[PDB]
């Protein structure tokens, strides 16, 4: 009825740039003004295709891999109280290292629901 899904979309090719530029309309938006009218190209130090052609990529990648792995390696009175030390060996229990693919069980969501509901 009125409330209904689509089951077929609109097909392009029948308006404003599609076949004869809507028969050459003199209508144009503010976003269709001249802007950024000059293409920048890659320079000699950036990654120009002449610079990228002679290169052996596997050796450089292996060197960067080696340096990154080396960096990751080199980084790393009242005695009469009814309860004794309950926290004996709890060394903070690294929940904040785990990444969990569940939006209701992420550590981010547990911190979120703890923080914003009183």
């Amino acid at each position: 009825t009125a409330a209904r899904p689509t089951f077929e979309p609109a097909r392009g090719g029948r308006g404003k740039g599609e076949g004869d530029l809507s028969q050459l309309s003199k209508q144009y938006s503010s976003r269709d003004l001249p802007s950024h009218t000059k293409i920048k190209y890659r320079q000699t130090t950036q990654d120009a295709p002449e610079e990228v052609r002679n290169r052996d990529f596997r050796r450089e990648l292996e060197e960067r891999e080696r340096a990154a792995a080396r960096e990751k390696n080199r980084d790393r009175w009242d005695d009469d109280v009814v309860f004794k030390n309950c926290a004996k060996g709890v060394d903070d229990q690294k929940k904040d290292k785990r990444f969990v693919n569940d939006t209701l069980r992420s550590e981010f969501h547990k911190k979120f629901m703890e923080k914003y509901i009183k």
């Binding site: 009814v82 309860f83 209701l104």
Partner: protein, 55 residues
């Protein structure tokens, strides 16, 4: 509020599934401490609201 109630249904289900957390030794400790405190203060326990309570 909907996300809160999803987490809350999860929490109530996990309580009924994973037993008490209270660890009955500890609950007896809590109860016994409260009993000794109330008998230490000579506390008179609150009766049922009487049929001819004037207040």
């Amino acid at each position: 509020t909907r996300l809160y109630l999803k987490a809350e249904q999860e929490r109530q289900h996990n309580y009924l599934k994973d037993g008490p957390y209270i660890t009955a030794e500890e609950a007896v400790a809590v109860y016994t401490t409260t009993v000794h405190w109330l008998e230490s203060r000579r506390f008179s326990p609150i009766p049922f609201p009487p049929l001819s309570y004037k207040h």
